[PDB]
Amino acid sequence: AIEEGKLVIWINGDKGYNGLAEVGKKFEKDTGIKVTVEHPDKLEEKFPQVAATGDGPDIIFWAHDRFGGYAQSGLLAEITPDKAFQDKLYPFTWDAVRYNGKLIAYPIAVEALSLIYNKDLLPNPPKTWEEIPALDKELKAKGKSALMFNLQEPYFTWPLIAADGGYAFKYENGKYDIKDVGVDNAGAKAGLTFLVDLIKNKHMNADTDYSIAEAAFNKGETAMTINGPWAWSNIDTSKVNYGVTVLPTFKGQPSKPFVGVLSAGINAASPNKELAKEFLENYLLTDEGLEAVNKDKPLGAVALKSYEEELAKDPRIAATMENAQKGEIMPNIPQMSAFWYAVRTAVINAASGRQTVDEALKDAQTRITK
Template sequence: MALPRAGWARTASDPLRVWVNADKGHEGLRRVALAYTQRTGRPVVVEHFEQAVDRFEAAMRDGGASGPDIWIWPHDRIGDWIQRGWIAPVRPGEAVRSDIVQVAWDGFTLGGQVWGYPLSVEAVALVYNKALVDRPPSSFEEVLTLHEKLKPKGIRALGWETGSPYFTWPLMAAGGAYVFQRRIDGSYDPRDTGIHHPGAVRAGQYLQQLMAAGVIPQGGLSYSEAEADMRDGLQAMWITGPWAWEGLAAAGIDFGVAPLPTLGGRPARPFVGVLGAMVVQASPHRAWAVDFIENHLLRPESLHTINADKPLGVPASRRMFWRLYADARVRASMEAIYAGRPMPSNPEMTWFWQHLSAALREINAGRPPREALEAAAAQIRALAVQGRPVASR
């Protein structure tokens, strides 16, 4: 395991530093930090950045002295950061462990150890315009019927970023596709990929069927195109996540959220992303960081403060979830999460994103799905067998 360069210049008298991306509830997090300081006398500084992950990785490559003690980011890159020695394993207390849903812990578990404290969980679901859809379809096959009903009005039934593995994966996983086989200790076997599984092929064929019917434009959709059509009332449903709710509400769309429909009679299985607080390996404040997270940040009142600033989506905390239970959108999102599976976090995910993205572009352009997916799987297996080093994303 690589270790940070020597020369950590900060001392135990420095404040605890928390970094978070600018799109999260950083103002709420600042209020939480202030309350902790007032209670304990220990200063906590919250800093937020656009493209915070780039800044975090640059700070870590430089030894970490300019970086945070606590780093808040989704779990999907922890495999690389663990390998580089940038984040520390943690041993959550029993009260914290029992309050947080298991799927969230699964996301932050790798190699038999836990690498972060989950704050929220998210997965894509079916967001629908209530003015256009009375009852969301229970199967993807029903989408074609709904489209025929809406087509005379110049409205498409459904859209999503069709070239993105993240948004298209739930349809592929419905039929049994898997990214990498997971071992019992939570690690993954990069030589065993199932992106070319017959279920994934059927999903690719269904996507091309939607294009042939005009539900999806020929060549596919980008995220911005799907979002614009949804906001403009030209698209009735959208496969997206809780981060899109605020924009739809601002556009005056009365929307509902439902679990993704089935495909071929089997439930769609989205990636579950887990936003969590990680403790930096080289921090001089590791014990202090754990105290702040376990005994203050994860309390329902603290999570409520952050959520009031910017919605967390679905909280990982059971106690916080029950506070939000009256919100039908949160309930539906939790259903989507329980149907999904944690996004793999091993470094080889770089290969998955690269080669499945290329395969989906080809499928969008009309290449037979089986050919495109088998070629992508063969490339991933070849890289794993060769033991190729994995570049940081």
């Protein structure tokens, strides 16, 4: 059983736990309640194990996608923020923490892919994907490529495929319809074809992956790449002068990147749910609370409007939120895994030529709706 009278918080080792402990200090200073921050190894696997026996931390931080599984097992308490607090966060972030019609966690941060570009090579990046082929021809004239990004993970290629109509699961009033999948439709077809054509026309290579693209951009060999806030620190050290902007549109429609929302759930077995709510709502989700964590390790964009408005002074973060609002929250249902694997295969096969675009998407679709 969990100890009453204090708060134990679990957050991953790559997050700003030292910064979070700073908020815990303020909480104890005001309430006299001690807050302990821990970052155990493989905590995403450990949590469901210990929470299943009625133990574990009072609060757990992790990408919202993982919370769907936890909520299915009844590991998370339904939260009770009032309307006043709900208005404080962007609407789409609340959708990311809803399972079976119930709010099961508090949104903290927001992450999505953006277009990263070299200001010296391309001071005026393209607003459309259609402009890229011509830009590549001009840049190649001087030994540089227009764009290089990870083509091995569907997470990176989907923004393009979704632009004109592709989608994983239709999200209606309440939840996701596992029977309405949009991988084998006109929009996805047009998007994947554009991607495959970039390859066949030599504007991109089917084998380009994360590390290949990262080094190419960091060495000034390619003018653009597509990546998230987590990659910025590994560019800053290269000195290259880069900018971060909205993803290019396709067929006049904005690219739609998936969105990940770092969230904080409350253990269903915690005898400290009220303390957890007080801490999360009135200490962490405030300008001062998020600043403490962010100052330690950047959160990227955040769910709290007031602080996001301040953070947006950084064009990289403003761009992150802009793309996020045009994208879609990653579905938190079990079937999303089937989606990732089926689509990963479709893109790889279509790009290598093993399958035609139509065959690739048809097979992915038929598999996902099983």
